[PDB]
Amino acid sequence: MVKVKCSELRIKDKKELTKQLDELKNELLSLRVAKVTGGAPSKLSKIRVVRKAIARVYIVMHQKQKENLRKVFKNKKYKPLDLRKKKTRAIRKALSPRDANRKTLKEIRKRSVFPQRKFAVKA
Amino acid sequence: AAHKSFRIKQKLAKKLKQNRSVPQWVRLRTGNTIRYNAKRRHWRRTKLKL
Amino acid sequence: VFLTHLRANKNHVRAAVRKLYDIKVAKVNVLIRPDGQKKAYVRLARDYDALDIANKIGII
RNA sequence: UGCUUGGACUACAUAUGGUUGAGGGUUGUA
RNA sequence: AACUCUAAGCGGUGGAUCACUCGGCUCAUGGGUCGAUGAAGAACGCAGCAAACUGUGCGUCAUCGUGUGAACUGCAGGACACAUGAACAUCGACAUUUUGAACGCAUAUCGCAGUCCAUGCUG
RNA sequence: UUAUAUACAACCUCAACUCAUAUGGGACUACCCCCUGAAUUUAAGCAUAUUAAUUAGGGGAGGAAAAGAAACUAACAAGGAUUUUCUUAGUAGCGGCGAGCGAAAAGAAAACAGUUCAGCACUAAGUCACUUUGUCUAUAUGGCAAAUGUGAGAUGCAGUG
RNA sequence: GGUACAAUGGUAUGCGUAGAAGUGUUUGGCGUAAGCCUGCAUGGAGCUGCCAUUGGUACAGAUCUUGGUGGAUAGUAGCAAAUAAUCGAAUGAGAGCCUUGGAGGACUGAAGUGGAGAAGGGUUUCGUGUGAACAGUGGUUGAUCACGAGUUAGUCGGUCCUAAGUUCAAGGCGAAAGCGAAAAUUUUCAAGUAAAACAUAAUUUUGAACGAAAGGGAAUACGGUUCCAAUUCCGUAACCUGUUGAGUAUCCGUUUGUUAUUAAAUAUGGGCCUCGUGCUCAUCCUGGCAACAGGAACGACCAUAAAGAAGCCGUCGAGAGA
RNA sequence: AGAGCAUGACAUAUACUGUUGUGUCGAUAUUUUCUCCUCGGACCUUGAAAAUUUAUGGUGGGGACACGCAAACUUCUCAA
């Protein structure tokens, strides 16, 4: 065969991804039968070859659907907690810098009348 | 005991599968040092305390 | 006889072998082996004779 | 309706609102 | 050619001595990052042949994308899947079982629920 | 209204929810803050003392933490937040004045950074949070405006100070 | 003052796979001595003299520490409790074992050494294979070692209920941890509705949960079957729980078969009326004097009663098993 | 189901099985087993609880009507 590529799995449809999922599932079911009934080739080692072939149809189906939810939970505040930036717990709480460095009107008025002047000293 | 729980039967199962020898190809790998199994228990000489 | 997933509750195994092998079941019994794997003795009905079903599975 | 199977949810303490309310607690137009 | 004494030689028993060192220790430098978005920890599973360690979570000794550009090896088997990419790193994607602060109630129990959405069997 | 006999209202004190949104527990151990607090030991015995305002126990954080811009020194010709090192100094003091213990100002360095409230004759609540609607351009606990929609707010929000 | 060990800084135009360190030795020596140099033998990749400066720097002792070893001793240490084996055969490299089967003498003597369970154990079970080690003798066998397998439930248990008790719930308290509290804390803290009216309306607070494989607690037995499982598989005959469905406590006097008499028919009475078919009345079951009976014959809530529900020693009678 | 079972008479070679007979009377004593029922005793000792279950009673409320069509979460019988 051809190694099933995530690069070429991505151009498929929603139907063809889960219709390729069951027929690789059915192979692994038949190779699971043939492992203990004395599989007559020295190995039908397509166990690992189709075991990882379904992991990638899964990966591609799963990130074709989370990237679609991220398209719907654009423009809405209160997106799900999974489509929301797990950085660290400390970083998510600690005054989002859009008001960690906002300032009082008394300090914006001390700011605009005496700037640090730029000077040099010797004779 | 012949009336056990599900959780003692799975910890008894895992110590049962772990009571194999070392496969003998493993001593054919390159620069190998594993000779015997060092975590073999007998049922009659070392108890499990479960 | 099958080896099944350790968390399959006998309405799984009855429904699994219908979907996979196009049969019907009289009775399922269920064991958990002393190595820790769940068996399932799936007695078929009287119509689905298990020798026609065994060689179509792949076993003898 | 009917049994199974899968999923979402159902802890506590708190803040701010919302919503339903209690009280011969002070009062008011009648 | 009793046994004994002593010496050396040879053989044994033993594992010192010396020479090694992907390990320790000590000093210094740069950096600042866990967790109710489920941490640390635990448990059990997962490999063609594997018990441990290491890795992982039914997508289970791996994993998208990248980098590099021919291996992996104990033995098979395939690599026609460089030449549209092996094996490795790297890792930003998806994912992460039962647990655990552990959050329906319990738990020497895989015990007992509720509410709700679906499907799979009446009509 | 309230012979607790028709409503009606508004507050105030308190409830309830699988309400909307959020927040908190637990881990680590070297350093850090808050607490609690011994005895061995030494005194050639031993009780105060010492060990020690320490081991152990408890709690809380950060990449540092704590401290910090004077209710401080000095007695000068005066200095000027904090913290660290050197010196002061094993000094002044404290002590069965025994064993022992024991700082600070000044001086010399490293580094340097300053400020904000409450409370007045501010002299039109001049403020804020939501929510919705336009509409910016992170996959934004964002940006602006509209309705000033609903609330916080006169038991005091902003600006000045 | 001198000598051993290891290093660092210098130094020796040092030494070394043409054999370094180490070790061995009747090679020859030197030194009062610590020690040193040397030959040969083994060994296989590093090391030494000098000046300085050093340091985890020199062992016979510590009932020293770790390891190894000797005698004692191949043994007058010992392998003597639980009565006892013997014949012949086969297998085998080898047999007193456990290896087997046959015969035979014995023991346990059923309060057992028999047959099953609960704790606990965890694969030890079983088949085949087997070589060392282990079975304090042997071993052809094994609870050893290798490989393969094996544990089936609506009825047996768990699970459900509570006991003694326990864990938590904010009255509380404590610096906190947490009470080696037992909180009983706690505005409506709990229920209730083929669900209402001038409060919809009647009612209750000890919250909650765990804690019994011997207490309480629905339902199954036989015959057969395996190398290995059976109240579980197989056959046969039942049973319980839940949910639907069907049948079946009300098949009249009038008047169809029938002139009334009746027949279909738990089955009418009344008064009049042409009799009546006119009119009107009527079925949430019957029997027995009773004790109580039958196939059924108002679980929708309150109330009360009973069952669950019980100890120990005895006991006439009955049945079962033996 | 001369069931099944067991004892027993033949027949059929592993040639993949059939068969004929039996299984019947009486009566002991089991203070020594287990159950069931009865009736007692000792006690300044009086010998669990809850789920669960049933019967009754009560006020309302439900149904039922003869010229016949019915019924019945029906405490009845069966079925899926």
From Swiss-Prot, chain B:
SUPFAM superfamilies linked: Ribosomal protein L39e
CC terms in the record's Gene Ontology section: cytosolic large ribosomal subunit
GO molecular function, one term: structural constituent of ribosome
Domain of life according to the entry: Eukaryota
Keyword Ribosomal protein: yes
Single GO biological process annotation from the record: cytoplasmic translation
Recorded coiled-coil stretches: none
InterPro entries cross-referenced by the UniProt entry: Ribosomal_eL39, Ribosomal_eL39_CS, Ribosomal_eL39_dom_sf
Keywords: Ribonucleoprotein, Ribosomal protein
Family membership: Belongs to the eukaryotic ribosomal protein eL39 family.
The name this protein goes by in its record: Large ribosomal subunit protein eL39
Species of origin: Drosophila melanogaster
Native organism taxonomy: Eukaryota, Metazoa, Ecdysozoa, Arthropoda, Hexapoda
